[PDB]
């Protein structure tokens, strides 16, 4: 359990984890912004019934 | 603690501060590598870098100033000595070192040609040598050689490292931010 920190130092793992989480969060937020259904800056105030849906 | 430098603070990645005088103890830009303590050899098992007085077949090309007997202006704009002999590379014919006799003589030091600049970039009157790396006082602490006719790779690194380390350690101002 805790012995993973005797193998990976806490400082390096924390910096990599923070960096990966920030990049992932920005990528997902930007992917949603580019979509029609989840461009919340633009549609945003539309109800779930009014929101765009992809073609069947 | 065999490198004579201490970390600034306890945070890792921090820079080292030299404890003594970094020019002589060989720290930072004054560091030298532990090369072989044997002279470099040419293609025919002869010393690669030798003074001209050991080989009279070498001369100075016409239209090139003879730097022997010329003053050596250091970073203080004060003459630190006079050039008296040239050390040339025999493998590839080129001036490698200048031998400088100090103002009060009593000793001779070497000066790599890479730190020598000529006035006006060598276009107008060439009446002196410019050494921007070291001060006239530190010319006396340049490491010496074991022999007066050959120079090993170990000492070759030491002389070059000593001069190159003086772009950061010649004066306190050279190791400080400009703004």
């Amino acid at each position: 359990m805790h012995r993973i920190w005797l193998m990976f130092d806490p400082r390096r793992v924390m910096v990599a984890m923070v960096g990966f989480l920030a990049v992932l969060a920005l990528v997902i937020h930007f992917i949603l912004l580019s979509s029609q259904r989840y461009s919340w800056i633009e549609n945003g105030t539309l109800s779930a019934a009014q929101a765009p849906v992809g073609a069947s | 603690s065999d490198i004579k430098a201490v970390p600034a603070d306890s945070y890792n990645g921090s820079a080292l501060i030299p404890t003594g005088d970094p020019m002589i103890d060989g720290v930072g830009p004054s560091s030298w590598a532990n090369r072989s303590d044997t002279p470099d050899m040419t293609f025919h098992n002869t010393a690669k870098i030798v003074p001209m007085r050991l080989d009279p077949t070498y001369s100075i090309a016409k239209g090139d100033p003879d730097p022997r007997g010329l003053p050596v202006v250091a970073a203080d704009k004060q003459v630190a000595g006079t050039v008296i002999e040239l050390w040339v590379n025999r493998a590839e014919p080129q001036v490698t070192y200048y031998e400088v006799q100090l103002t009060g003589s009593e000793r001779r030091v070497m000066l790599p040609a890479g730190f020598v600049q000529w006035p006006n970039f060598g276009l107008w009157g060439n009446d002196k040598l410019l050494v921007k790396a070291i001060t006239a006082a530190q010319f006396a602490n340049v490491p010496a050689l074991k022999r007066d006719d050959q120079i090993t790779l170990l000492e070759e690194d030491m002389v070059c490292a000593y001069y190159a380390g003086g772009h950061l350690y010649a004066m306190a101002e050279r190791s400080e931010p400009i703004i």
């Binding site: 130092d9 | 890792n12 050899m41 098992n45």
Partner: protein
């Protein structure tokens, strides 16, 4: 076939060759100053440091 064509196949063969070449050159880059020193101990990136290479000098 239809979507797959010769230019694409050649491009991917070149990509594999380039990646192998980069691995080889990165191995050659680690012949001096390795292994790295860290508080946690010795460190080597990928690719790992190669075997010690010795030169040959002329006799005196």
């Amino acid at each position: 076939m239809q979507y797959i064509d010769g230019a694409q196949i050649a491009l991917y063969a070149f990509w594999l060759f380039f990646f192998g070449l980069i691995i080889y050159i990165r191995r050659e880059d680690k012949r001096e100053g390795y292994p790295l020193e860290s508080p946690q101990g010795p460190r080597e990136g990928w690719p790992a440091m190669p075997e010690k290479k010795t030169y040959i000098h002329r006799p005196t």
